[PDB]
Amino acid sequence: GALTESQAALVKSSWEEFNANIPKHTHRFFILVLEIAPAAKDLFSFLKGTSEVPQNNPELQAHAGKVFKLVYEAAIQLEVTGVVVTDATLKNLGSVHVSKGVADAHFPVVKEAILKTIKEVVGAKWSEELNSAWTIAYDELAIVIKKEMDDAA
Numbered sequence: 001g002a003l004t005e006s007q008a009a010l011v012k013s014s015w016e017e018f019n020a021n022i023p024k025h026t027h028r029f030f031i032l033v034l035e036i037a038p039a040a041k042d043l044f045s046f047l048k049g050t051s052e053v054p055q056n057n058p059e060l061q062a063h064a065g066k067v068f069k070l071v072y073e074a075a076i077q078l079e080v081t082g083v084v085v086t087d088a089t090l091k092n093l094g095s096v097h098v099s100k101g102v103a104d105a106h107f108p109v110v111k112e113a114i115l116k117t118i119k120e121v122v123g124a125k126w127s128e129e130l131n132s133a134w135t136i137a138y139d140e141l142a143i144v145i146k147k148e149m150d151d152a153a
Protein backbone atom coordinates (compact mmCIF):
# COMPACT_ATOMS: atom_id res chain seq x y z
CA GLY A 1 0.00 0.00 0.00
CA ALA A 2 2.63 2.53 1.19
CA LEU A 3 -0.38 4.77 1.65
CA THR A 4 -2.46 5.85 -1.21
CA GLU A 5 -4.60 8.95 -0.54
CA SER A 6 -7.60 6.67 0.12
CA GLN A 7 -5.73 4.53 2.77
CA ALA A 8 -4.66 7.77 4.43
CA ALA A 9 -8.29 9.06 4.37
CA LEU A 10 -9.45 5.84 5.93
CA VAL A 11 -6.76 6.04 8.68
CA LYS A 12 -7.69 9.73 9.35
CA SER A 13 -11.38 8.77 9.73
CA SER A 14 -10.95 5.86 12.18
CA TRP A 15 -8.60 8.13 14.20
CA GLU A 16 -11.30 10.75 14.74
CA GLU A 17 -13.75 8.06 15.77
CA PHE A 18 -10.90 6.85 18.03
CA ASN A 19 -10.59 10.35 19.37
CA ALA A 20 -14.35 10.80 19.90
CA ASN A 21 -14.18 8.68 23.09
CA ILE A 22 -10.66 8.79 24.60
CA PRO A 23 -11.35 7.34 28.08
CA LYS A 24 -13.10 4.34 26.68
CA HIS A 25 -10.93 3.52 23.71
CA THR A 26 -7.70 4.10 25.62
CA HIS A 27 -8.90 1.89 28.52
CA ARG A 28 -9.82 -0.77 25.90
CA PHE A 29 -6.39 -0.39 24.28
CA PHE A 30 -4.54 -1.21 27.55
CA ILE A 31 -6.89 -4.10 28.32
CA LEU A 32 -5.90 -5.47 24.91
CA VAL A 33 -2.16 -4.96 25.55
CA LEU A 34 -2.37 -7.01 28.81
CA GLU A 35 -4.39 -9.79 27.28
CA ILE A 36 -1.69 -10.29 24.63
CA ALA A 37 1.22 -10.03 26.99
CA PRO A 38 0.35 -10.04 30.66
CA ALA A 39 3.93 -9.48 31.72
CA ALA A 40 3.90 -6.08 29.99
CA LYS A 41 1.97 -4.69 32.92
CA ASP A 42 5.19 -4.17 34.86
CA LEU A 43 6.79 -1.66 32.43
CA PHE A 44 3.84 0.73 32.87
CA SER A 45 4.19 3.14 35.86
CA PHE A 46 0.44 3.52 36.20
CA LEU A 47 -0.60 -0.12 35.66
CA LYS A 48 1.67 -2.15 37.96
CA GLY A 49 0.43 -2.16 41.55
CA THR A 50 -3.22 -2.41 40.38
CA SER A 51 -5.88 -5.01 39.81
CA GLU A 52 -7.30 -3.86 36.50
CA VAL A 53 -6.78 -0.92 34.20
CA PRO A 54 -7.93 2.42 35.59
CA GLN A 55 -10.76 3.96 33.54
CA ASN A 56 -10.42 7.70 34.32
CA ASN A 57 -6.65 8.09 34.71
CA PRO A 58 -5.28 11.20 33.03
CA GLU A 59 -1.71 9.97 32.34
CA LEU A 60 -3.02 6.73 30.82
CA GLN A 61 -5.44 8.64 28.60
CA ALA A 62 -2.79 11.21 27.43
CA HIS A 63 -0.12 8.62 26.81
CA ALA A 64 -2.44 6.17 24.85
CA GLY A 65 -4.07 9.05 22.97
CA LYS A 66 -0.60 10.25 21.97
CA VAL A 67 0.51 6.82 20.77
CA PHE A 68 -2.38 6.61 18.32
CA LYS A 69 -1.81 10.23 17.23
CA LEU A 70 1.79 9.48 16.32
CA VAL A 71 0.78 6.51 14.14
CA TYR A 72 -1.94 8.59 12.38
CA GLU A 73 0.63 11.37 11.65
CA ALA A 74 3.10 8.80 10.29
CA ALA A 75 0.36 7.53 8.03
CA ILE A 76 -0.15 11.02 6.62
CA GLN A 77 3.56 11.51 6.35
CA LEU A 78 3.97 8.27 4.40
CA GLU A 79 1.24 9.32 2.00
CA VAL A 80 2.56 12.92 1.46
CA THR A 81 6.34 12.43 1.62
CA GLY A 82 6.85 8.70 0.99
CA VAL A 83 8.90 8.13 4.17
CA VAL A 84 8.66 8.51 7.87
CA VAL A 85 11.01 11.30 9.05
CA THR A 86 13.19 11.20 12.11
CA ASP A 87 12.88 14.50 14.04
CA ALA A 88 13.80 15.47 17.61
CA THR A 89 10.68 13.96 19.19
CA LEU A 90 11.11 10.47 17.83
CA LYS A 91 14.82 10.37 18.89
CA ASN A 92 13.67 11.46 22.32
CA LEU A 93 11.16 8.57 22.09
CA GLY A 94 14.03 6.12 21.42
CA SER A 95 16.07 7.10 24.44
CA VAL A 96 12.91 7.01 26.58
CA HIS A 97 11.96 3.49 25.38
CA VAL A 98 15.52 2.21 26.08
CA SER A 99 15.21 3.75 29.53
CA LYS A 100 12.00 1.98 30.42
CA GLY A 101 13.44 -1.41 29.28
CA VAL A 102 11.64 -1.73 25.92
CA ALA A 103 12.96 -4.22 23.41
CA ASP A 104 12.30 -4.87 19.70
CA ALA A 105 10.20 -7.98 20.49
CA HIS A 106 7.75 -5.83 22.41
CA PHE A 107 6.72 -3.87 19.30
CA PRO A 108 4.48 -6.57 17.87
CA VAL A 109 2.56 -6.58 21.16
CA VAL A 110 1.50 -2.94 20.84
CA LYS A 111 0.79 -3.33 17.12
CA GLU A 112 -1.83 -6.05 17.65
CA ALA A 113 -3.52 -4.04 20.38
CA ILE A 114 -3.75 -0.98 18.14
CA LEU A 115 -5.13 -3.19 15.29
CA LYS A 116 -7.66 -4.79 17.54
CA THR A 117 -8.52 -1.46 19.22
CA ILE A 118 -9.34 0.09 15.83
CA LYS A 119 -11.36 -2.97 14.73
CA GLU A 120 -13.69 -2.45 17.70
CA VAL A 121 -13.75 1.35 17.40
CA VAL A 122 -14.91 1.20 13.71
CA GLY A 123 -17.30 -1.76 14.23
CA ALA A 124 -19.06 -2.44 10.89
CA LYS A 125 -16.92 0.04 8.87
CA TRP A 126 -13.87 -2.25 9.22
CA SER A 127 -12.15 -3.35 6.04
CA GLU A 128 -8.89 -5.06 5.10
CA GLU A 129 -7.73 -1.79 3.63
CA LEU A 130 -8.03 -0.06 6.97
CA ASN A 131 -6.17 -2.92 8.67
CA SER A 132 -3.39 -2.70 6.07
CA ALA A 133 -3.03 1.13 6.24
CA TRP A 134 -2.62 1.04 10.03
CA THR A 135 -0.30 -1.96 9.77
CA ILE A 136 1.93 0.01 7.42
CA ALA A 137 1.78 3.21 9.42
CA TYR A 138 2.75 1.33 12.58
CA ASP A 139 5.57 -0.73 11.01
CA GLU A 140 7.32 2.33 9.47
CA LEU A 141 7.16 4.48 12.59
CA ALA A 142 8.40 1.49 14.67
CA ILE A 143 11.36 1.07 12.26
CA VAL A 144 12.32 4.70 13.03
CA ILE A 145 11.83 4.30 16.79
CA LYS A 146 13.74 0.97 16.79
CA LYS A 147 16.60 2.95 15.21
CA GLU A 148 16.74 5.76 17.73
CA MET A 149 16.57 3.15 20.49
CA ASP A 150 19.69 1.30 19.29
CA ASP A 151 21.42 4.74 19.09
CA ALA A 152 20.73 5.52 22.80
CA ALA A 153 22.13 2.12 23.82
Ligand code: HEM
Pocket residue numbers: 040043044045046063066067068070071093096097100102106107108109110138141142145
Ligand atom coordinates in the same frame (compact mmCIF):
# COMPACT_ATOMS: atom_id res chain seq x y z
C1 HEM B 1 5.20 2.95 17.28
C2 HEM B 1 4.92 2.41 18.47
C3 HEM B 1 5.09 3.25 19.77
C4 HEM B 1 4.83 4.54 19.94
C5 HEM B 1 4.27 5.60 18.95
C6 HEM B 1 5.08 4.87 21.33
C7 HEM B 1 4.98 6.11 21.89
C8 HEM B 1 5.26 6.36 23.23
C9 HEM B 1 5.00 7.65 23.83
C10 HEM B 1 4.29 8.84 23.11
C11 HEM B 1 5.35 7.53 25.12
C12 HEM B 1 5.23 8.62 26.21
C13 HEM B 1 5.69 10.00 25.70
C14 HEM B 1 6.14 10.87 26.87
O1 HEM B 1 5.25 10.98 27.76
O2 HEM B 1 7.32 11.26 26.79
C15 HEM B 1 5.89 6.22 25.35
C16 HEM B 1 6.29 5.79 26.59
C17 HEM B 1 6.36 4.45 26.95
N1 HEM B 1 6.30 3.43 25.98
FE1 HEM B 1 5.86 3.74 24.01
N2 HEM B 1 5.65 3.76 21.96
C18 HEM B 1 5.67 2.74 20.99
C19 HEM B 1 6.07 1.44 21.28
C20 HEM B 1 6.11 0.90 22.58
C21 HEM B 1 6.20 -0.47 22.93
C22 HEM B 1 6.41 -1.61 21.93
C23 HEM B 1 6.16 -0.59 24.26
C24 HEM B 1 6.28 -1.82 25.17
C25 HEM B 1 5.32 -2.22 26.00
C26 HEM B 1 6.10 0.74 24.79
C27 HEM B 1 6.18 1.03 26.12
C28 HEM B 1 6.39 2.25 26.68
C29 HEM B 1 6.61 2.54 28.11
C30 HEM B 1 6.80 1.41 29.13
C31 HEM B 1 6.58 3.87 28.23
C32 HEM B 1 6.66 4.71 29.54
C33 HEM B 1 6.60 3.86 30.81
C34 HEM B 1 5.73 4.24 31.97
O3 HEM B 1 4.76 5.04 31.82
O4 HEM B 1 5.99 3.65 33.06
N3 HEM B 1 6.11 1.66 23.73
N4 HEM B 1 5.78 5.50 24.18
Ligand SMILES: c1ccc2cnccc2c1
Pocket residue numbers: 060063064067110
Ligand atom coordinates in the same frame (compact mmCIF):
# COMPACT_ATOMS: atom_id res chain seq x y z
C1 LIG C 1 0.81 4.54 27.06
C2 LIG C 1 2.08 5.08 27.01
C3 LIG C 1 3.01 4.55 26.19
C4 LIG C 1 2.74 3.49 25.32
C5 LIG C 1 3.65 3.07 24.38
N1 LIG C 1 3.33 1.99 23.61
C6 LIG C 1 2.14 1.33 23.72
C7 LIG C 1 1.21 1.76 24.65
C8 LIG C 1 1.49 2.90 25.40
C9 LIG C 1 0.53 3.44 26.24
